[PDB]
Design a binder for this molecule. Structure first.
Ligand SMILES: [Ca+2]
Ligand SMILES: [Ca+2]
Ligand SMILES: [Cl-]
Length: 203
């Protein structure tokens, strides 16, 4: 049963479902195994692949989600039942910590997606058909969660692959499979959907 790691992927030639997508200090990063591709805030051709180890050497060989906390521009990485927090490429003291240190229940063993909602600066952690709202200031979970994605959100599917709110202009992108949904922060109405290859990788 032991197997060899994966081969380096070709972004536009093959169908890649990324492990996480996030905007870290201006740039949009696409994660897939030990690889990363970066594009500077657009819809055009990412520079890569580079290795996740070039920037964050402590991380395991595959992540489940990643977002950046606005309060202090820190990067938060989820992998299995643990999370790491970095300043830049500097791991913070006391990490990895089990997901429960964030207020998530013991049963949650993997996270699907995560981002910071610019409309209220809160953090949303998605896992399966439910999500949690984390208060980054009080550094604690809010009351009344988790809630089901289907109940609380507008046409957002379960089992998301990633989610991002681009600092530029108030629109939240929800990624799933080969597609993404675009939500208007204010209205919360799905303004459109499109292709990740076309609209994000600039294939
Ligand atoms: Ca994210
Ligand atoms: Ca993911
Ligand atoms: Cl994500």
């Amino acid at each position: 049963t032991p197997t060899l790691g994966p081969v380096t992927p070709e972004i536009c030639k093959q169908d890649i479902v990324f492990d996480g997508i996030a905007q870290i200090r201006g740039e949009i990063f696409f994660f897939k195994d030990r690889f990363i591709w970066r594009t500077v805030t657009p819809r055009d051709k990412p520079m890569g692949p580079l290795l996740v180890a070039t920037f964050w050497p402590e991380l395991p060989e595959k992540i489940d989600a990643v977002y950046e906390a606005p309060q202090e521009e820190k990067a938060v990485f989820f992998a299995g039942n643990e999370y790491w927090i970095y300043s830049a490429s500097t791991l913070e003291r006391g990490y990895p910590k089990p997901l429960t240190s964030l207020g998530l229940p013991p049963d949650v063993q993997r996270v699907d997606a995560a981002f910071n909602w610019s409309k209220n600066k809160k953090t949303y952690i998605f896992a399966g058909d439910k999500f949690w709202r984390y208060n980054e200031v009080k550094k604690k979970m809010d009351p009344g969660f988790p809630k089901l994605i289907a109940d609380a959100w507008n046409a957002i599917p379960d089992n998301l692959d990633a989610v991002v709110d681009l600092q530029g202009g108030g629109h939240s992108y929800f990624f799933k499979g080969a597609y993404y949904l675009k939500l208007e922060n204010q209205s919360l109405k799905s303004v459109k959907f499109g292709s990740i290859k076309s609209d994000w990788l600039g294939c």
